[PDB]
Amino acid sequence: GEAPNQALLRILKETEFKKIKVLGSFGTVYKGLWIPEGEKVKIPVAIKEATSPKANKEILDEAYVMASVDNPHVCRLLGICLTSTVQLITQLMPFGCLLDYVREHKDNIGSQYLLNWCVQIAKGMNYLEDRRLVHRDLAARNVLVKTPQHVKITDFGLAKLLGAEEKEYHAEGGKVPIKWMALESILHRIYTHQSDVWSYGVTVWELMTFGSKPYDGIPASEISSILEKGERLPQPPICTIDVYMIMVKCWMIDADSRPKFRELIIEFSKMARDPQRYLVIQGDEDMDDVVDADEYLI
Amino acid sequence: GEAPNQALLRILKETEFKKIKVLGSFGTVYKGLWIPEGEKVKIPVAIKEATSPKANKEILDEAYVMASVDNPHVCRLLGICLTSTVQLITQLMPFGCLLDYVREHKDNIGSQYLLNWCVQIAKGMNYLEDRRLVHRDLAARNVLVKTPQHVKITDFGLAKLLGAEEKEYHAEGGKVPIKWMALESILHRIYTHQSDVWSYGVTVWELMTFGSKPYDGIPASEISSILEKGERLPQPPICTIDVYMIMVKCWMIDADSRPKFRELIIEFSKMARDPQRYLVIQGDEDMDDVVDADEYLI
Ligand SMILES: Nc1ncnc2c1ncn2[C@@H]1O[C@H](COP(=O)(O)OP(=O)(O)NP(=O)(O)O)[C@@H](O)[C@H]1O
Ligand SMILES: Nc1ncnc2c1ncn2[C@@H]1O[C@H](COP(=O)(O)OP(=O)(O)NP(=O)(O)O)[C@@H](O)[C@H]1O
User: Fold this and answer.
1) Number of Cβ within a 10 Å radius of residue A6
2) Rounded distance from Cα B29 to ligand 2 centre (Å)
3) Which chain B residue lies closest to A72 (C-alpha atoms)?
4) Taking CB atoms and an 8 Å limit, are B266 and A291 in contact across chains?
5) Which domains are delineated in chain A?
């Protein structure tokens, strides 16, 4: 069939960590510290906390996905705590979602950064493709910032692990973010790693325009029509044709004609060696026991 | 028994790469470029080239090991070329072995670096332990420098993959580097991940003393005696007792009493957040298509 998922799901004791402040508000997210008992470490973590049998089902499914992945560019799940309300414990990503971050720092974001992020995101997604996993919701809002030099992919709430020989995923009805979806996805609810590539393309466009909304002001209703007309998102001001060309390819109607994440890594990597050649931006240039989750291993 | 090693051994065509200059001279090592055909990439690589049926056996065994590992802190094997003489193609590590590198740059090596290297090396070794692999030859001469901020473990010429339930490796006779070996290894040719920890300890000492030779001038003959006497390598000048304490533990006679690599990561990681507190050092502060192997994936 396929390989045995021997990932480990760690169950955390509530006494083991303390919420410190609120981060957001669905359920409710906190920043806090996890202190495994008897190890002298403190780990900055994000804690996500009515009780719907359906809602629990979803969060548990997400936990399942996150627990099955391990990559420097994908969010790491530390554990779950099974209190009346289930809590997801993940690594704390200090600078929040990348979409809010390019918006809030446009005047300090250089080409070196933009290209590095495009590279890391492709590495993340290429890893996911290796693990035969399709994200289905890749977008700037779904990439968190550990540091300005290190981003990771998140929000596995829609991800699907393709079965043994299943190569497309056929969803059957849902509330999906249409502006980041491939055309096959919109017309036939078919999802693929290549479908992901399309969203990667739109994601890159969000970064290149410092946070602009795709098809701003265009009802999702018609988005589908537009794409068939042969239309696409416009070339961002800072983008040399080289970069834009890559986006446009991520948006070919023939999915097999789009590039592979492993190719996206090489291309954006090359451009990252000489940033200024590919992106033209104005003026380019107690806690003694705190340990980052990236250094805390089982 | 255990999991199926589905790693991929890539066989490279000789036409596909060119040696550019000599790096060292056993057989002979070169720096060159690998250009997969039809991909527009050029990859800086190291090429290692009488023909002894025994010698081939060894290099092939090494290739086997290197092809089975994948970690940011372990050397990556790109492929082998089966010409009259077998050639190993690995990623080019520009700054050479770390032992030569701390020697050649003592006056520019700060605590931030030393501690980061101790961290990366522990991550490498912890990864190897996860892969049930025992290195048996960890030492500063066996760590290469990709950049001053990124080192990787190498030389798998002695490594052993422990069998299904085999937990010690019992070698049967060899030319082994005694000054980096655990006491059980010297007296009983027994090797363990914990045995590796001992060598990690000596390795760290080499870094902390900027390249000094362990037990300088003491015949390997007696090394064994000394250790039983309760003696060990001396505390390096720059080492706060905190750091030295860690080395000393890597050298406990009871192997299970030594720390685990995953613990070594946490400890040196913590110290890396405030370097100056743990190490006291004087004055602490064409090729358009070139792609680093770390960005070239299958
Ligand atoms: N690990 C984390 N570290 C720091 N911030 C996080 C982390 N996880 C989530 N956040 C932020 O917490 C807030 C809510 O996150 P999330 O659970 O994705 O809800 P959302 O995407 O903002 N809205 P919704 O999709 O309706 O639940 C957002 O600011 C997230 O970016
Ligand atoms: N991938 C590499 N990149 C750069 N330098 C390398 C690489 N691999 C090996 N070298 C260097 O090439 C020279 C020989 O390497 P190696 O094959 O380990 O022989 P050695 O350890 O120096 N001597 P020996 O153990 O007797 O073969 C040394 O300077 C190595 O550090």
Assistant:
1) 7
2) 7
3) B72
4) yes
5) 1-92 (3.30.200.20), 93-285 (1.10.510.10)
